[PDB]
Design a protein around this nucleic acid. Structure first.
Ligand SMILES: [Zn+2]
Length: 595
RNA sequence: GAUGCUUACUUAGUCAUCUGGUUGGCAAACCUCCGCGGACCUUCGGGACCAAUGGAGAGGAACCCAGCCGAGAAGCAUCGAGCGCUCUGACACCA
């Protein structure tokens, strides 16, 4: 499908006043830039507003404007595989004709007809004013703006909507099968119990009301009463991260021997730049400016301080596999997106991987099943379905890196550290509330403490990802096995509930998964995420699937355990790694304990 | 490795008992009401978002800005250790 994983890997450095430049002069310059960023965001938001109305609706006959929409979103498929001009240049030509700001054979007759249909539509007041302003812009700015709007609308609407469609079809089939297999006794009787809840304010799927004793209707409601929710569209809000202004070619002048960057604004003419100092390129960082030239510069604001991003090209490594990672993600996202659809997804993924292998996959498939625990973590290694050895990973960060916590708040990147900042926040927002009441949360209230906590969490995730990548590179792996854990929470997470602010301190296992997947696809590897199956409470040697629930947690609290059935003595992490490595193969099944 | 001076510098990459502490606020910044106009979802109750070459008030608790103290980056200057040279913790960066 779409090439989700590109080869860009952009790097962000903070901007600093140049030593020659005066501090007041630097404040005046960051003011000129803040204005340009605001204008760019406004223009992109307006163009997205104009273009969102041409989408083809689900369950309706196709309108004549659809093929222009698909050309605008994905010119690569629309254009022939070979053409001199880049696809984005063709996108700009189509957009100008559509908005009223094409005979080239690169464009098809259907595309021209659809754009003719599109242009013959009424323009709102916002659209007319936006196009009047956009007329004056340079073709480079117009093209960059159109590309950014297209990528934004694609990523933020179309992916989620297509996933929602595929989810909805399976929801139809599953509800039909459910209604036609066990409960044949509810053709209409559901209405009698539904009406009483309808007349009241019960606008929620999971009925947060305790059982009355229809309870079969209750299980039916929490499952198949309402359709899967449709994704809610938004625009590039300047309050959140939103998008980043792009200074393409001939607009930036970055120097590296000494770190100064020549940014150029839209109004500024040729040969004039705004020089700023920035954090110098790391020496140990593997790529260097000499290796690959910088394609463009991406600017965005955190808090009020500007940051810049350098975009360069880094080639990918060809994987021994004859398939892509996007297909493996596609299976789970679209083909099997449900809870019964997990066993089928895993079987299909295993088949697809095995058939794509050049030689004998069973004899030689270098596999590394990594589990992610709290204090510690270990990864198993498989070559041919035969366990070789388990490796420890150093993931506790203190004055030095260790593999385990040495023997009240633990110094270093720990739950205690994060939770102490969460408590500070819980004790500091109160007085803000009272003072605001006296005068008479927001995403600017504790704007330094939260950004610090976010940087801490992402640093922890980066540590985990790089450690895993290094372990995989040590012994030439081709496949990394990961679970679907949500994440861990710090001690102060629960006492700061009801606020999205507390989400800054969630440990984000998914962030680790994304980083690992990106870095693995970087090096010619594949990542498959099995569905959560609680590997910790499953013995690798014999699949006992322990359920004591009282003694197991105590054993995990000291890092050792003992299987109830036979008596294996391995540490919890090694057991879980072996369990995942087996589960990828056919030797262990998913619980599937829904009924 | 130690020591001293200077800097329109940093204290908003993380950790090492650590967004360092403190004093205040004209401009400015930040903050609160609208709201021309656009728009996504919706159980129609409402939720969420952008926005005028757009207009009105207000806090220095929070946001922002400035001063002071503590500290660290370097350019130079002294001595030293090891072997003139090498000489300042660990990690980590696809935002
Ligand atoms: Zn056992």
């Amino acid at each position: 499908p779409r090439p989700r994983y590109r080869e860009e890997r952009t790097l962000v450095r903070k901007l600093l006043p140049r030593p020659g430049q005066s501090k007041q002069e630097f404040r005046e310059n960051v003011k000129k830039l803040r204005k340009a960023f605001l204008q760019f965001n406004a223009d992109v938001s307006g163009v997205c507003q104009w273009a969102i109305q041409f989408r083809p609706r689900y369950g309706k006959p196709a309108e004549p404007t659809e093929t222009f929409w698909k050309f605008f979103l994905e010119p690569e498929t629309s254009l022939p595989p070979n053409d001199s001009r880049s696809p984005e240049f063709r996108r700009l030509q189509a957009f100008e004709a559509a908005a009223g700001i094409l005979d080239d054979p690169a464009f098809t007759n259907e595309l021209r007809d659809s754009i003719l249909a599109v242009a013959s539509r009424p323009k709102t007041k916002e659209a007319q004013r936006l196009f009047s302003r956009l007329k004056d812009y340079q073709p480079a700015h117009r093209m960059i703006l159109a590309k950014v709007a297209a990528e934004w609308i694609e990523s933020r609407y179309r992916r989620a909507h297509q996933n929602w469609e595929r989810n909805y079809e399976e929801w139809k089939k599953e509800k039909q099968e459910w209604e036609q297999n066990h409960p044949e006794l509810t053709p209409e009787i559901r209405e009698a119990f539904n009406q009483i809840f309808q007349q009241l304010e019960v606008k929620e799927k999971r009925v947060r009301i305790c059982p009355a004793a229809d309870e079969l209707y209750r299980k039916w409601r929490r499952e198949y009463w309402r359709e899967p929710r449709k994704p809610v569209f938004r625009y590039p809000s300047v309050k959140r991260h939103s998008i980043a202004k792009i200074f393409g070619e001939n607009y930036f002048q970055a120097d590296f021997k000494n770190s100064v960057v020549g940014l150029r604004l839209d109004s500024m003419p040729a040969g004039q730049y705004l020089e700023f100092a920035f954090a110098p390129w790391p020496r140990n960082y593997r790529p260097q400016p000499g290796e690959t030239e910088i394609s463009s510069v991406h600017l965005h604001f955190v808090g009020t301080r500007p940051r810049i991003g350098f975009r360069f090209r880094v080639p990918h490594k060809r994987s021994r596999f004859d398939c892509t990672q996007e297909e493996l993600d596609e299976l789970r996202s679209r083909t099997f997106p449900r809870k019964a659809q997990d066993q089928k997804f895993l079987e299909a993924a295993r088949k697809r991987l095995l058939e794509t292998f050049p030689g004998n996959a069973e004899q030689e498939l270098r596999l590394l099943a990594v589990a992610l625990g709290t204090d510690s973590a270990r990864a198993a290694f498989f070559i041919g379905k035969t366990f070789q050895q388990a490796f420890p990973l150093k993931i506790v960060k203190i004055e030095k890196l260790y593999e385990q916590w040495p023997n009240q708040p633990r110094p270093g990147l720990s739950r205690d550290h994060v939770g102490r900042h969460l408590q500070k926040m819980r004790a500091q927002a109160s007085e803000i509330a009272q003072k605001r009441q006296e005068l008479t949360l927001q995403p600017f209230d504790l704007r330094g403490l939260t950004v610090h906590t976010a940087r801490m969490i992402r640093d922890w995730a980066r540590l985990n990802a790089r450690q895993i990548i290094q372990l995989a590179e040590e012994n030439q792996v081709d496949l990394i096995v990961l679970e679907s854990l949500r994440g861990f929470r710090p001690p102060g997470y629960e006492n700061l509930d009801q606020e999205k602010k507390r989400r800054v301190a969630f440990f984000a296992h998914g962030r680790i998964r994304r980083k690992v997947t990106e870095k693995a696809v970087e090096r010619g590897m594949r990542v498959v995420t099995v569905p959560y199956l609680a590997s910790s409470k499953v013995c690798a040697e014999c699949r006992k699937k322990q359920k004591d629930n009282k003694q197991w947690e105590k054993n995990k609290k000291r890092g050792l355990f003992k299987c109830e059935g036979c008596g294996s003595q391995a540490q919890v992490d090694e057991n879980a790694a072996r369990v995942l490595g087996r589960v990828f193969w056919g030797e262990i099944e998913l619980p599937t304990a829904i009924p």
